[PDB]
Amino acid sequence: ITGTSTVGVGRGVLGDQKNINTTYSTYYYLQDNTRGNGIFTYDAKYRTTLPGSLWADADNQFFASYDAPAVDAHYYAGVTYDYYKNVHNRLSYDGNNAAIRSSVHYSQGYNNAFWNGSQMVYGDGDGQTFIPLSGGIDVVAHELTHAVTDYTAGLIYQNESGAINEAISDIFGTLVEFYANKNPDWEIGEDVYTPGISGDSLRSMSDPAKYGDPDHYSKRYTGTQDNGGVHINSGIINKAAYLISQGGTHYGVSVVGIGRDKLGKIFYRALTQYLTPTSNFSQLRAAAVQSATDLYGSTSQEVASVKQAFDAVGVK
Ligand SMILES: O=C(O)C[C@H](NC(=O)OCc1ccccc1)C(=O)O
Ligand SMILES: [Ca+2]
Ligand SMILES: [Ca+2]
Ligand SMILES: [Ca+2]
Ligand SMILES: [Ca+2]
Ligand SMILES: [Zn+2]
Residue ranges making up the domain that contains 36: 6-154
CATH for 282: 1.10.390.10
Q: Considering every ligand atom, which ligand is closest to the CA of 30? A: 2
For this entry, resolution in Å reads 2.0
Q: What is the DSSP string of 90-146?
A: --TTTSS---EEEEEEESSS---EEE-SSSEEEE---SSSBS-GGG-HHHHHHHHHH
Cβ(142) – ligand 1 distance below 6 Å: yes
Do 200 and 293 share a domain, yes or no? yes
Q: How many domains does the chain have?
A: 2
Neighbours of ion ligand 5 (CB under 5 A): 193-194, 197, 200
Amino acid letter at 103? Answer: S
Domain boundary among 104, 130, 154: 154
CATH for 30: 3.10.170.10
Closest CA to 70 of 2, 114, 135: 135
Do 130 and 268 share a domain, yes or no? no
Whether 214 is covered by a domain: the verdict is yes
Do 221 and 90 share a domain, yes or no? no
Cβ(104) – ligand 1 distance below 6 Å: no
Do 117 and 169 share a domain, yes or no? no
Structure determined via: X-ray
Do 282 and 179 share a domain, yes or no? yes
Asked whether the beta carbons of 55 and 38 are under 8 A apart, the reply is no
Asked whether the beta carbons of 245 and 260 are under 8 A apart, the reply is yes
Asked whether the beta carbons of 120 and 103 are under 8 A apart, the reply is yes
Domain boundary among 98, 133, 154: 154
Quote the CA–CA distance of 6 and 21 in Å, as a whole number. 6
Quote the CA–CA distance of 25 and 148 in Å, as a whole number. 31
Do 140 and 159 share a domain, yes or no? no
The conformation of residue 299, written as its DSSP 8-state character, comes to T
Do 113 and 162 share a domain, yes or no? no
